[PDB]
Design a protein around this ligand. Structure first.
Ligand SMILES: CCOC(=O)Nc1cc(-c2ccc(C)c(NS(C)(=O)=O)c2)nn2c(C)nnc12
Length: 112
């Protein structure tokens, strides 16, 4: 498999995932200034902007590493927030809608 089409695919996939985050709550890192206790149990913060930077730094060279960081966006949010919050439900919805996006993209990658 060749690097350029793979990265093209990840760029598109990231945009597609970002589209699911309609509230844009996962677009940027959790503001430690607004949420001071955040790092106390979240050992690897993640967000779509950071994923973009990792992508263009050639840090995602296979689908799994890409999907791992997406999954962190979701699990960090589920971990930090109580179940009866908008945040927690947004992460569930992202997991759900994101999963379909990722499966389709992976099958595109396996044709390469
Ligand atoms: C007991 C309160 O718990 C929380 O405040 N949790 C969370 C809070 C925020 C959050 C707050 C305030 C602001 C201003 C932002 N800004 S932004 C541009 O990232 O949307 C984000 N994100 N977040 C994410 C993801 N996951 N959990 C949380």
């Amino acid at each position: 498999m060749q690097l350029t089409p793979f990265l093209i695919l990840l760029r598109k996939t990231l945009e597609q995932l970002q589209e699911k985050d309609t509230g844009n709550i996962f677009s940027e890192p959790v503001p430690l200034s607004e949420v001071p206790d955040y790092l106390d149990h979240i050992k690897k913060p993640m967000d779509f902007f950071t994923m973009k930077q990792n992508l263009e730094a050639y840090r995602y060279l296979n689908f799994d590493d890409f999907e791992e960081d997406f999954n962190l966006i979701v699990s960090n949010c589920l971990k930090y927030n109580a179940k009866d919050t908008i945040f927690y439900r947004a992460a569930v919805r992202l997991r759900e809608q994101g999963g379909a996006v990722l499966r389709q993209a992976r099958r595109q990658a396996e044709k390469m």
